[PDB]
């Protein structure tokens, strides 16, 4: 419970959305609940543009957008499933963009929670049955199976 993960923190996104669109769509539940500052998204964007968070993993591309922890009010996590792949720049400096389709936006300010959530993300994104299921499932199912791992 060190982290707030609500039901409306899980949502699907249409094909006509850009990188900023994803960030804004995912940050707003965090904003409404007052989990982060009210211009969280602008910060996340600027942080992504300098330190890209695209992860080249098979078979479902992941990105994990965040910002400085000094913008978080309480720990929270917002998930987004893309209908079509959207390009995130690769977190490792590789020329080729990650075809992201699952996005874990992190609004964490507690260090001991940050490390734990990252370790978890690393574990989950190497489970191809899980990652693939996240596409076909609905919000609740997604919420359910992710919560079952928290």
């Amino acid at each position: 419970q060190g982290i707030h993960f609500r039901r409306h923190y899980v949502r699907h996104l249409p094909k006509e959305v850009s990188q900023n669109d994803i960030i804004k769509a995912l940050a707003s539940p965090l904003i409404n609940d007052g989990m982060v500052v009210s211009d969280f998204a602008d910060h996340v964007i600027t942080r992504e543009q300098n330190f890209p968070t695209g992860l080249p993993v098979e078979p479902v591309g992941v990105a994990i957008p965040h910002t400085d922890s000094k913008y978080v009010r309480q720990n929270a996590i917002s998930v987004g499933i893309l209908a079509e792949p959207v390009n995130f720049e690769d977190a490792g400096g590789e020329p080729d963009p990650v075809p992201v389709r699952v996005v874990f936006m992190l609004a964490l300010g507690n260090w001991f929670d940050i490390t734990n959530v990252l370790w978890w993300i690393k574990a989950v994104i190497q489970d191809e049955d899980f990652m693939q299921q996240l596409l076909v499932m609905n919000d609740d199912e997604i919420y359910q199976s992710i919560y079952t791992r928290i």
Partner: antibody, heavy 131, light 109 residues
Framework: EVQLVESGGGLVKPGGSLRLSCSAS????????MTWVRQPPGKGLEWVGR??????????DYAAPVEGRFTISRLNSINFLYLEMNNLRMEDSGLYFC??????????????????????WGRGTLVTVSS | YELTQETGVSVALGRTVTITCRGD??????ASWYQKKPGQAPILLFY???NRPSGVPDRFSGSASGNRASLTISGAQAEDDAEYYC????????????FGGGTKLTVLS
């Protein structure tokens, strides 16, 4: 341009109390994790404890031989770090350092809670616990 | 001192020397490295998997394998004659930290 100056060390009888201070400058003390480290005489560096920042709720962690006796605190308004020591023993004596604490975690190989490192140190203040 | 270091290691001036640090927690956590001379504050030399703080000479490097961690001074100088400590978690997954016993590096010639 970081500057840390420990103070408050001195001679104290076993069982006694003592309060070490640390004036911090040159950086953002407020959101900075701070750590106390000591060096007993003729021995090496020893980690005493560390206070975290705002996101962590100013949580503090302590070394086992010191847990329960010592208290780490901060007053961010004048960038001071403190170390409240009670019920001292001979082995509590040494040179006490304060140091700016950085957090490190590598994503692909890391294991929570990653690691803490000590980028800036002060000169230390001498604690002597003798009868 | 669950992190074990060599008591003393010598190195000819100009030559290359590696000090190591071993412990079970190193299988999970990196170490960071400090130089200390008596009467002076310690100096952070190296941390992480590949991180050296600015202002620290290039002769210093850290590395890691299995349950051990090691600092390598390439082309040891007179100034390098000091104490070196490593620091890391005391156990795997620990919020606490710990220091090795410390290696005295005397520079020869």
């Amino acid at each position: 341009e970081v500057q840390l100056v420990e103070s408050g060390g001195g001679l104290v009888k076993p069982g006694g109390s003592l309060r070490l201070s640390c004036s911090a400058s040159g950086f953002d003390f407020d959101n900075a994790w701070m750590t106390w480290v000591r060096q007993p005489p003729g021995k090496g560096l020893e980690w005493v404890g560390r206070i975290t920042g705002p996101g962590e709720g100013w949580s503090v962690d302590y070394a086992a031989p010191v847990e329960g006796r010592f208290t780490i605190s901060r007053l961010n308004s004048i960038n001071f770090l403190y170390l409240e020591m009670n019920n001292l023993r001979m082995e509590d004596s040494g040179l006490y350092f304060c140091a700016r604490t950085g957090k490190y975690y590598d994503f692909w190989s890391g294991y929570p809670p990653g690691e803490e490192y000590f980028q800036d140190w002060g000169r230390g203040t001498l604690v002597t616990v003798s009868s | 001192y669950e992190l074990t270091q060599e008591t003393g290691v010598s190195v000819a001036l100009g030559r290359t020397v590696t000090i190591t640090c071993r412990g079970d927690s190193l299988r999970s956590h990196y170490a960071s490295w400090y130089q200390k001379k008596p009467g002076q504050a310690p100096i952070l030399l190296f941390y992480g998997k590949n991180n050296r703080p600015s202002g620290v000479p290039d002769r210093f490097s850290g590395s890691a394998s299995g349950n051990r961690a090691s600092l390598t001074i390439s082309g040891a100088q007179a100034e390098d004659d000091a104490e070196y400590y490593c620091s890391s978690r005391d156990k795997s997954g620990s919020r606490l930290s710990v220091f090795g016993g410390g290696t005295k590096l005397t520079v020869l010639s």
